Design a protein around this ligand. Sequence first.
Ligand code: HEM
Ligand SMILES: N[C@@H](CCS)C(=O)O
Length: 184
Amino acid sequence: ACTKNAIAQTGFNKDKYFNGDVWYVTDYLDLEPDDVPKRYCAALAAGTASGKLKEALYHYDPKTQDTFYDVSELQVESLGKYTANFKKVDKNGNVKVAVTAGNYYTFTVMYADDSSALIHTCLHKGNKDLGDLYAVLNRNKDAAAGDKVKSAVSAATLEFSKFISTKENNCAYDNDSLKSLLTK
Ligand code: HEM
Ligand SMILES: N[C@@H](CCS)C(=O)O
């Protein structure tokens, strides 16, 4: 279960974050890691399509090859805090699993600038029991975390040394599909 009420960045710039470009997860902190953690790579595009906030997600497990995409409309709870009903889609946006109540994640932007971000997310999916996840994002895949985002990790009272890096995972990313999914 999730346990954190993450605080959104003061002065969060939504238009800059939701600009249609891609964010890569470079490091993450899972508060309830499984006994045997599945080391996935992940990226997202966040944008506005016809006035609606949207996110497209990409997950890739470089060992199992499991690969899946999602698209969500985001609903606003407050500035920088969203609730997202996801639908699983193929890379082209064709629906594989429809939106359903109880399948959603919350998403809080704790820090963001031009090139980096720190987010919190809580996933709810069926009758699964999932926990909090923090993620460091960068506009450049596998970019080393800079001082601004690392300081934000500290200011959130988290220890960056506890985060798991994706940068040495032999990750590959379908960024063109992520961008085009924003309309789907
Ligand atoms: C490296 C970072 C991440 C890892 C290691 C990771 C891992 C996973 C895993 C193992 C699952 C399968 C859950 C299950 O069904 O048992 C999953 C699903 C999911 N994750 Fe992540 N995740 C990451 C980042 C993110 C981010 C940043 C978001 C939201 C912005 C997100 C949203 C979701 C959603 C919505 C699903 C369910 C998709 C579906 O069933 O259609 N994940 N992730
Ligand atoms: N909260 C998720 C992290 C990946 S989205 C989990 O419990 O595995």
